[PDB]
């Protein structure tokens, strides 16, 4: 797991996200979609987005980004004690949305990139280590539920 020190770093970094949840959410999803266009195909509500301009101009994409990061922030504030929060997400993503664990890897990487991009020189080596661990824990606990369901 993460240490107390590490959790404190994670939630300190998260303060940056909470100051502009929509901006961060948008950039995360744009980073995902542009870097991995197959991921866009998982969203019937975003498949019409043919260009990054169109993505950037989509109010609904920003709305979804807020939903995404709000759910993730809920999970993070539980400091690993997130069974109740993570289980239904694991299950809707495997059973309904059909999201391979690789895509969760993609978005984890996207969050790290976006933090650097929006906060260059203000997301230190310790911060990245702690946030990376938190995102890995999240991914790994989802992966456990995916295996349970035989998904992917
Ligand atoms: C590649 C695509 C996918 C990735 C990566 C991904 C990653 C993540 C992620 C990682 C940080 C979090 C947190 C996250 C959280 C959510 N997510 Mn998700 N998600 N996610 C979808 C695709 C993906 N998610 C789709 C498709 C829907 C339904 C969208 C709609 O039509 O309204 C959805 C829906 C949702 C919803 C709405 C409730 C539900 O349906 O369970 C939340 C919350």
């Amino acid at each position: 797991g993460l240490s107390d020190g590490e959790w404190q770093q994670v939630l300190n970094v998260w303060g940056k996200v909470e100051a502009d949840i929509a901006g961060h959410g948008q950039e995360v999803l744009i980073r995902l979609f542009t870097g991995h266009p197959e991921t866009l195909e998982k969203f019937d509500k975003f498949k019409h987005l043919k260009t990054e301009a169109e993505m950037k101009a989509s109010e609904d994409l920003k709305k979804h980004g807020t939903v995404v990061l709000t759910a993730l922030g809920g999970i993070l504030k539980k400091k690993g004690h997130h069974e109740a929060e993570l289980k239904p997400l694991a299950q809707s993503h495997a059973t309904k949305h059909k999201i391979p664990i690789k895509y969760l890897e993609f978005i984890s990487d996207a969050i790290i990139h976006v933090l650097h991009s929006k906060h260059p020189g203000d997301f230190g080596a310790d911060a990245q280590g702690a946030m990376t661990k938190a995102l890995e824990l999240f991914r790994n606990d989802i992966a456990a539920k995916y295996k349970e369901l035989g998904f992917q």
Side-chain angles (χ1 to χ4, degrees):
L2 278 72
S3 69
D4 292 319
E6 284 171 339
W7 280 122
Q8 184 172 46
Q9 289 236 255
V10 175
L11 296 181
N12 184 265
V13 172
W14 194 256
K16 295 175 151 53
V17 175
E18 294 192 321
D20 180 18
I21 187 139
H24 286 80
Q26 184 183 253
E27 294 190 33
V28 166
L29 289 174
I30 288 176
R31 177 69 180 187
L32 181 66
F33 296 160
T34 62
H36 313 273
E38 71 273 33
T39 63
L40 191 78
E41 296 308 305
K42 295 292 178 174
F43 296 86
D44 288 342
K45 76 179 174 196
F46 301 135
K47 68 192 183 70
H48 65 95
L49 294 168
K50 286 317 193 307
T51 64
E52 183 169 343
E54 279 165 354
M55 298 179 187
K56 186 75 164 77
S58 172
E59 300 301 341
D60 198 50
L61 185 158
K62 167 186 284 190
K63 183 193 185 168
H64 192 65
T66 299
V67 167
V68 171
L69 290 195
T70 296
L72 183 57
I75 286 163
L76 293 172
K77 293 173 182 314
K78 289 303 299 288
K79 303 196 297 171
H81 295 88
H82 54 216
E83 171 69 20
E85 292 83 3
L86 186 138
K87 194 190 172 172
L89 282 192
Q91 297 197 328
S92 67
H93 288 58
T95 314
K96 196 177 194 295
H97 311 312
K98 328 288 202 186
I99 307 307
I101 192 92
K102 191 122 199 111
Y103 292 6
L104 301 175
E105 182 188 8
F106 295 158
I107 205 174
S108 295
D109 285 347
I111 289 164
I112 294 300
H113 172 83
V114 172
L115 289 166
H116 279 301
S117 179
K118 296 179 76 52
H119 312 278
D122 192 36
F123 178 42
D126 53 4
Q128 183 181 154
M131 188 52 80
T132 294
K133 272 185 92 160
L135 290 172
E136 289 174 330
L137 179 58
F138 169 74
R139 198 150 80 248
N140 199 68
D141 284 355
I142 294 180
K145 304 297 185 201
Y146 273 29
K147 181 173 171 277
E148 181 177 7
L149 302 166
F151 172 70
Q152 254 24 14

